[PDB]
Amino acid sequence: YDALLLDRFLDILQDLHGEDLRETVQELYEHSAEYEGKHEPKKLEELGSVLTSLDPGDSIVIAKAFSHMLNLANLAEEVQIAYRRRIKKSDLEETFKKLVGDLNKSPEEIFDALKNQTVDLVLTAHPTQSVRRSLLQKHGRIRDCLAQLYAKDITPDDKQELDEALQREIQAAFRTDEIKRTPPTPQDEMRAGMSYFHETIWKGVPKFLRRVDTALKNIGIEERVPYNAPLIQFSSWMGGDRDGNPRVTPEVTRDVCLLARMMAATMYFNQIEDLMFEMSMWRCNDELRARADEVHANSRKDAAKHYIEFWKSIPTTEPYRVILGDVRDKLYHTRERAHQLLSNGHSDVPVEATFINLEQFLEPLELCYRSLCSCGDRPIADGSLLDFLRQVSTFGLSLVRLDIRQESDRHTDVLDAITTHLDIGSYREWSEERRQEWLLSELSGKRPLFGSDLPKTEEIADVLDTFHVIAELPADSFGAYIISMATAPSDVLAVELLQRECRVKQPLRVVPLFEKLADLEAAPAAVARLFSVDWYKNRINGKQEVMIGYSDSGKDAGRLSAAWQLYKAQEELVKVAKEYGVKLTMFHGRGGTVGRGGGPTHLAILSQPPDTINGSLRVTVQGEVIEQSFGEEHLCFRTLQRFTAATLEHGMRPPISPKPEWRALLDEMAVVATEEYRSVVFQEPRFVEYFRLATPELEYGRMNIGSRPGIESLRAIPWIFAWTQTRFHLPVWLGFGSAIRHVIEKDVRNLHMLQDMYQHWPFFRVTIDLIEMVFAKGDPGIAALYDKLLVSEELWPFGEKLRANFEETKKLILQTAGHKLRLRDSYITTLNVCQAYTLKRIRDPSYHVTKPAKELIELNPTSEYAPGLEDTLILTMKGIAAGLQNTG
Amino acid sequence: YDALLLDRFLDILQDLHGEDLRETVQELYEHSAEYEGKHEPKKLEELGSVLTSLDPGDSIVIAKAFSHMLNLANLAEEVQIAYRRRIKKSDLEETFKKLVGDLNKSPEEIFDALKNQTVDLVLTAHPTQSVRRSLLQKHGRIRDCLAQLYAKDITPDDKQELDEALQREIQAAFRTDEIKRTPPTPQDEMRAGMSYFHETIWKGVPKFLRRVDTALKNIGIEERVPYNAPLIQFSSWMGGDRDGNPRVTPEVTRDVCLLARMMAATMYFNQIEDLMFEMSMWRCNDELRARADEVHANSRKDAAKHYIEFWKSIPTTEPYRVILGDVRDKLYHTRERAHQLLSNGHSDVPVEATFINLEQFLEPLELCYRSLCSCGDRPIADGSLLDFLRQVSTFGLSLVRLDIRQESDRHTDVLDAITTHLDIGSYREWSEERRQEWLLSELSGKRPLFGSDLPKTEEIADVLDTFHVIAELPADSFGAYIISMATAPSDVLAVELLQRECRVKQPLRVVPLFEKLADLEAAPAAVARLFSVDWYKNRINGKQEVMIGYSDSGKDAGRLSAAWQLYKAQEELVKVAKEYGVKLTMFHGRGGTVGRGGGPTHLAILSQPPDTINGSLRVTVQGEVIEQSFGEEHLCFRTLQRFTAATLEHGMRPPISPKPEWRALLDEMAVVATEEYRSVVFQEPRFVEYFRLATPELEYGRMNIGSRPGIESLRAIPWIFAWTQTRFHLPVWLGFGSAIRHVIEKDVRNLHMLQDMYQHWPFFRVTIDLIEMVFAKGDPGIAALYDKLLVSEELWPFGEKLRANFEETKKLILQTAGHKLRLRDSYITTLNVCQAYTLKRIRDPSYHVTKPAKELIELNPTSEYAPGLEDTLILTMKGIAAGLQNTG
Structure with missing residues (x-):
């Protein structure tokens, strides 16, 4: 053949x-x-x-x-x-079966453990896609x-x-x-990345979730996975990681954020009319009827000829269509606002006419679902409306949450420019203790730090401007700020203060990246020393993520020594987080090649030390691997299956601990x-x-391949x-x-x-x-x-x-x-x-x-x-x- | 089962x-x-x-x-x-086989007869869809x-x-x-009609044409059906037929025309980016290279951030993408112009930025096809580019061409208001000869007829305003003006003069509707008398269409007498058209029920007298029948197949003439x-x-069901x-x-x-x-x-x-x-x-x-x-x- x-x-x-x-x-x-x-x-x-x-x-x-x-x-x-x-007529239903028989685990343990399980796939623009x-x-x-x-x-x-x-x-x-006769721009990288959504992931996610529902019913669980249960999430580095890629500028980050937002809005808007057509019911509970009366009150009796379908004011006969009608109006205005904000620099579209909250969107759909179930229509509600609920709760207003990665020494340069300009010393020359004490005093103080008159290098102004770009933009568009070559708490506190001083209204979580082997040996000590800071431990709110790099470890030392030291690193990191009562989720910077920690996903997950995931995992999908795991419906499903099954088994079937x-x-x-x-x-x-x-x-x-020079x-x-x-x-x-x-x-x-x-x-x-x-x-x-x-x-x-x-x-x-x-x-x-x-x-x-x-x-x-x-x-x-x- | x-x-x-x-x-x-x-x-x-x-x-x-x-x-x-x-592993390939074996017909006769064959399916909003x-x-x-x-x-x-x-x-x-607690508006009828395109017909047409190509290759014809060969076309009455439906106003016709145009533009625009992605070739002939250099000259080196993909100026490396890039710009501006023209009353979008011609669109695609074939890429050209060419040549800038139907007596009332106001008599009271002589003198004269000061009834102003609406709008959006209860040439000439005087720049063809049995008996005489008018015979340009109604015939007389008289009518109409050297195409107003001339399509076509179609047929698809013949891919294909095979067989296998x-x-x-x-x-x-x-x-x-009161x-x-x-x-x-x-x-x-x-x-x-x-x-x-x-x-x-x-x-x-x-x-x-x-x-x-x-x-x-x-x-x-x- x-x-x-x-x-x-x-x-x-x-x-x-x-x-x-x-x-x-x-x-x-x-x-x-x-x-x-x-x-x-x-x-x-x-x-x-x-x-x-x-x-x-x-x-x-x-x-x-x-x-x-x-x-x-x-x-x-x-x-x-x-x-x-396909001609068979690990695996999801097999994993459930082995968890029931082998380990004597009950269905509700599988279901409950599943509800509280989260797997955050973060797509990267690493130049491995040939x-x-x-x-x-x-x-x-x-x-x-x-x-x-x-x-x-x-x-x-x-x-x-x-x-x-x-x-x-x-x-x-x-x-x-x-x-490729010319190398891409970061924007092109982000497009190549996002293109898998309006091709595969967008439709793939709800189908996979239907399959989990089915498998759960094969165990006797008539209930369904909650639509807002965050079983899988997507993050991105495309346009965000600027570590050694000076072409990832603040304007690039703005661009990829606005871009992604426009993509998401467009997809929802194209879905919404078909959903309106199907929600033709007339029975609702008193709640949805009251709300539908509210919307039909401010109905704006106008032609609304810009739409093709439902251009006539929707009658209260079909209340689901009324509420979904308002949802379509707010989608239209959200799309128009994002498209203008992208195409020009500004938009006249009122913000109140759009969805501003990640759940101002979710609320009307939740209401429709409650009404449908109340009226005996759970079968109907578990159809297109459920698919849509899972798409909204899974993708939000911006298809992926963007991480910002930058090396510590650049933050160090910024702070040194500040302390030199303030005639107070040189943050570079300062010992770690001095850095900690100063950073702490400035974070808990109430006076602004630098002003408009701060002398800035192009690099310095690059990082400050990226912080202004982050502050200017919506909070739910961003994920985590990853610090490359992080070695001391002064680096995390530095980023925290630099955020607060750049008036970042809702600052994002800071996370260190330990990739060199010595950094992996010293990492647990540094994390414990960070948690010792009562201020940070109180603002971190019991949750901490730290990234664990796989690329550089097996480069300077033995691949074997690197893998073993990684195992120790996960183990002791979990030890430290439990010691300070903080929920640790570790971010594995795995590649596609085994030399960068790649290989089959369930094997890499089983090789993690026990009680280190605890229903919260995060893995990179490096450039080329994206194509390998999402270019087809079947590849997408097999990927999401592999990840969720591996994490679940590792949760209920803990691997043996070493003698x-x-x-x-x-x-x-x-x-x-x-x-x-x-x-x-x-x-x-x-x-x-x-x-x-x-x-x-x-x-x-x-x-x-990539845009990094x-x-x-x-x-x-x-x-x-x-x-x-x-x-x-x-x-x-x-x-x-x-x-x-x-x-x-x-x-x-x-x-x-x-x-x-x-x-x-x-x-x-x-x-x-x-x-x-x-x-x-x-x-x-x-x-x-x-x-x-x-x-x-x-x-x-x-x-x-x-x-x-x-x-x-x-x-x-x-x-x-x-x-x-x-x-x-x-x-x-x-x-x-x-x-x-x-x-x-x-x-x-x-x-x-x-x-x-x-x-x-x-x-x-x-x-x-x-x-x-x-x-x-x-x-x-x-x-x-x-x-x-x-x-x- | x-x-x-x-x-x-x-x-x-x-x-x-x-x-x-x-x-x-x-x-x-x-x-x-x-x-x-x-x-x-x-x-x-x-x-x-x-x-x-x-x-x-x-x-x-x-x-x-x-x-x-x-x-x-x-x-x-x-x-x-x-x-x-499907589990077989009339009909297209069977019809070709019988035409070759039974009738000794050659492949090139089938192919040539096929090229010059046209079947015009015209969708109606008749209130038969329950x-x-x-x-x-x-x-x-x-x-x-x-x-x-x-x-x-x-x-x-x-x-x-x-x-x-x-x-x-x-x-x-x-x-x-x-x-239905309230009856639809004509606009709703037109939406229900058009919804089958962005559901079935749009994708169905190119697949069917691929199948004809395949069947033609099973006979030994390596050549393919020309993309511009008009084998099938679509027309509409939805929003156009105002005969006894006073709710079909001029503004309704404007609305359905603008609407359809917006739909078509949108569909092309969504196709065009995928087509641009596939046309990634670098070889072209000197022609397409020269044109691509032209477009890259006026490339407008701008961000063009409103697009998602290809927002960077397209490089001359991939010339097909350059030319298709200009095609996408002109599509965008056409969509924006139609959407504004619809949503408001006007648009600031320049007309030169849009496709104004039915082939200003076709030209760049034709060029791409010539280049591809020139460079040995006919397989590539016969793919998505061909599908797109057939969609453009088949659907044009407005998905369907709209017919306007109105009864003769309303035109009579208009003219009578004019002659009364001009102190010249009463067109009503005038004999046929007087009407003919006057109409002729006014058509060949150069002075305007009525002015702004003409006294108008609401009905009179309805028909005059519909003519102004027709004049204001693009020519390729309209089809034919059908005159109900037409009995004399004075009615056709009346509509012609009423068009010319309403400054209809490119007036549409006028066609009579004979539906009552006596009208069918008298029809050939009336058509010959019309062709006798040297003026009309010179302006009709050798082509004439006349509609033949099936609804009212079997109502006042015997169903049998009606069918037989219809046969005679087709026969003698063809006789008259050949007598005056005019190409006749007859428009069959068939229903879905046999009582309105319905029944299987190939049977109704075989029951037509020989040498009456001659590669040009036109049939109504009455309301409900649309759902029956286009609601599924398979129904759509079976419909187009049934029609094209029936017409072809009736062309090469003439039915026996009666003793x-x-x-x-x-x-x-x-x-x-x-x-x-x-x-x-x-x-x-x-x-x-x-x-x-x-x-x-x-x-x-x-x-x-319908909007007619x-x-x-x-x-x-x-x-x-x-x-x-x-x-x-x-x-x-x-x-x-x-x-x-x-x-x-x-x-x-x-x-x-x-x-x-x-x-x-x-x-x-x-x-x-x-x-x-x-x-x-x-x-x-x-x-x-x-x-x-x-x-x-x-x-x-x-x-x-x-x-x-x-x-x-x-x-x-x-x-x-x-x-x-x-x-x-x-x-x-x-x-x-x-x-x-x-x-x-x-x-x-x-x-x-x-x-x-x-x-x-x-x-x-x-x-x-x-x-x-x-x-x-x-x-x-x-x-x-x-x-x-x-x-x-």
Whole structure:
């Protein structure tokens, strides 16, 4: 069946570029097949020999072909998964069943625990989404074609029109320039993010909630999940995170807030007329009748011809239509106000004509629901009205709540400008205690701090202006202010005072981000010291959120040491919060790649220490992962299901807590793994050299994914990208070899203890299993070829050392777990080869450079490199990322 | 399987009103079952005995229950038909096959004949739609539930959510007041009409055209139907027909025109952004590149923040997106202009910023298509861009072209006011010749006619003002001006002069409506006399349309005589048009009931005389029929298919022309049938009395369907309604008995001649077959019960006479054709009984009359009749109409 796609696409490729190129693509596929079958490293060079003969444009066409083949492979993969899962006639109903039988838990415990459960998915604009939006659309259409094709109810003409349709849709996808020739603006990032709502999430959320209701009734719970029960929520960083992205200005934040608000209003307004049409009942209780009489009193007997439907004043015969009629008027005026406020700088639309409250909207719908149930119409109320109630209570007046992230040192600079200007010292030079005492005195004091006459840098004025932008805007549009590189309470208090002094009427919660490993070690101490401040503990109102970063941890230290220290961090943070009687919710900055803490969601949730979630979870959805988890109805449902089921199980089925022997064993193991990791990644003075030669790291910024413009000093995203492109995955597995070897060396019974740990400890089981998966996506012959083609003859053995470790480490992993699809790896291998030789040509002086476009080579006329080369490189990176189903 | 619906609905009924009422509904169903099985007329009285015992509100609930049961029966009927037809894995591909094999016709003849074929469906607001819109919505949802239920791919939870959904949707439909408590405005009629576009027709048309392309490729025609090939078009009367509807004012016509324009703009604008997203190509020919450079020149480098997507100036990289970008700007400004022009009286939006031409819109899309095909992207161009091209070329700037219908005598009054005021005579008193000569002199003269100082009646000023309204508005918004009761060229010339003098810049075509039988006899003479006028023949530009009414013909004369005279009328009209070298297209004012010329569409088309269509047809879709032919994707497709296939076959497979013996035989037969019909419907002086007692005719106006406020003097719609409610159908079959009896009497070989005619003449075969169908929907026991309950003891035998004829006539029908589901007739019979006894209670003096609502009896507090009775009567009419699948 894998052959069908090859047939259709290759027929189209032949229809576009002739027999010859189709035949050379087939040759490359056959060489790659002989390689992924026999694994003769001679086959690689055999393939590169055929690859070097290519024309400028021809190699572009080859890279294009294999990349689109990988994409189609992903799409057919998703289709086959959806159908395979559907033809069954963890999981929600299964999780309920296991909670009842295994753990003897009652239905009302599941229901009550469910009501008080919340999962806050926060979408980020992290530059990990390799596929441009113009192509993502065509992918969506194409998987629609393939999904409709996968059925036995096709009529001949339907299938032929879908053949013509899929053919035209592939031909359209291939006819688009895959290369972002300019990097997006943060606004574009926020649009790419929000586009999944008026595509999937908006309609997906109420369907999922219906499904939870159904599953709850399969357990005997006739009651339904409360419409205002916040089982899932959405937050955003798009346009808010300005950490090291100076292009995220205050005006950008204003723009994304106003934008999102306009989107939400528009969606509600388009829903509201259909809802009015259905709410044609005439029975209501005395309450809704009284209110309907109120609205029909101020009915404004006018033409109201701007509407299409219901332009006549609604009669009291159908009172639900009266009340919903006022709801439509207030929606119209809310949309018009937001659209004017966005399109110009201002609006003449009166605020009282609009919904100002998150529940001025909810109130009339709640009333309709009470009336319907009162009058025996709970079936009716649980339909479109309920869907609408859940959409309002879930999305509010601004589809997502925006977080503002900024690094502590910028707040420090602001305060230092203030104290210098006030002739009182230098906040920078001040000790922590001095900062705390001063900040406290200013927060509890009543005199304004700086004035209009404060000297400001562009950076200083950037952060002050972002605070003014936050104050100017509605409170329910924002989420949390995340402080990067937070180390002391002076940073949180600093942001609090900077908010109060920027007249932020309802200041948002402040939350620290500990991402470097030392910050994770020191974090519980800092949180306890913050809670010690009686002022903050009294204003924090018993609730605190703190973010836990996964990107930079496994970058400077061992991936293993990072994971273990994270576990300790969650544990001790919960300890501290309980010690001060504060409800802690921890914010997990997980990525899509395992190297940034990614991997399957239920596995990452089960690997959390027990009694650390307590019905309140928060996870990042990093750029690319959005597409993976919300681009289809089915993906959206499977995502929301995975999250809610994992959290519920982790709530009622607490994972086993580690025996102390396991604690100490992992402490030693963490020392060994850290020394091993840092030994090869930092001690080696020629390591940075070999890295900058052997991996496509430095070229990452060429793809222009995001809007953000030593090895310790690079972002974790291109770090994991480099080693994942080459399918070597060094940062995933490094410390494990020395770790396990030293642990079995110090004691032989530690082998039985590792076997013991792998079978009972969810954290260890998850860790080892993930390492084994990453090994399964590994092939060291690739990194070998890259070394042979690009590394100087000198330090060739260095890589082999690592390669040694690779196999060694794998041998240990399979030994602790007790273990002993393909074909896509064929295409990937081809692109691997293409990526390798092309890099050698790029780092040559002969291939350097010293109107409309009618062919691909004309697409890059400003290339500092040879005409056809830059585009081909970008193509190889994109394609390999697609094949591996991860970018960074 | 019929039992499933009964089970679900009766369970809901029990959940709403208890066991007792469910049990009495079951008793009624059982009595009706014993009646429709055994046909014991004692069973009817047995049922009425149980019916008379009912409470005021209880009988309302019973009528409600049987009516909704009939509706559900209709919906399940449609579902089972759609699935039965789909599980085949006339008709389009079958029609092509028969045209190739049977008639030896070539593909290019089918294709070329198809290109030059046009079918103009014109939706009317005729008050035949019994089901109010608030309920039609719920019906749509309910058939959605049932359609999704009819499958073997249901997952358990899907089926349970659809059970809860169908339950809540039925419960919602039943909880709505079925009674229109106030009659609609013409604007409401036009909304009910147009609502099928942004529901079905808008998306249905391009899908149907794709299907025609597919069928054409199954014959070997790789080419596609031209996007601008006008295979189907839509016109409207809603808000335009003012014949005997004085509530259709000029402001109403303005309103429906502006309204429709706003709807169209909105739909295009919502499509355009998705189209822009897909047209991401970079290759274009020098033409589209030049134009894209033009647009990017005047690009207006601005924020353009009112849009959500593509708010940044579009780069020349993606030229299709540039050109489509200008298209989106001109759409935005067109929508804003129409919305302001509607909501206020005026707009500041510049006209040059909008699409003014029907093809200023089409031009940029045509350019994109040429470019795409030029660059080898015909597959891409035949996708969303083609769908959009067909939508634009098919729907234009105003979704439908509006006809204006008005009776001749009103134009006569206008002209008479003018000639009286000009001290020149009285146009009324003038002979036809004088009218012709004067009208001609004024049309070819250059002096204005009346001035501001013309004395005007409210009627006169109504028609003059409608002409000013037509002149003020865009030309492509209007269709034809239909003249009711047109008899002479003076009427058409009158409208032409009245247009020119009202400064109608681009005057619309004038078309006469001949509906009374004498007008159909005299019509060809009048058309020839009109074409004799050299002026009109020169300005008519070789094209003429004339309407042929079906409503009033079979009302004053025999249904048979009417059909035959219609055939002659089409024939001789075509003769006359060919004689004057003018392309005639005839406009068939067909209804939904056979008594108004309704019946299956392909049968009505085959019954047209040969060489009378010639690739140009025009048919009314009377009120209720709209719902029947466009309320579902499948209904819409089946409608467009039926029409286009019928016209094509009638074009290439001309029906046999009648032998002269058949001609004369039908002339005699028409005399006999006319004498027989008029003998019982007009000669009898007590006939009007018996009619006003035995049928629910007089109560029709109580349903408040439409906005329009002797027996010869009533509308044909309540005429057919009366006899169809009672399932007697007198106007369908009356003259056939005497006709066939006299024809077999004058000669015995005429029996073999009738057998000969039924097997070879499409017109006769259709006629007789239709009569047999109507008989199959007949049961004279019903009319018997109505007579027994409501007719005075005196003229009881009169009806029996008719009843005699009934059987007699049926015996003849089955004899010329050579011939010898049920259960739903059960429910109908119950309502029959309920309708009968209730009428007897209504026409009683004891049951006459000399805040919010918390129960059904409170729903009519102004009833001149007893509290519960009026509503129950309306309910019975609605339900019986639903069961018979026809209103009038």
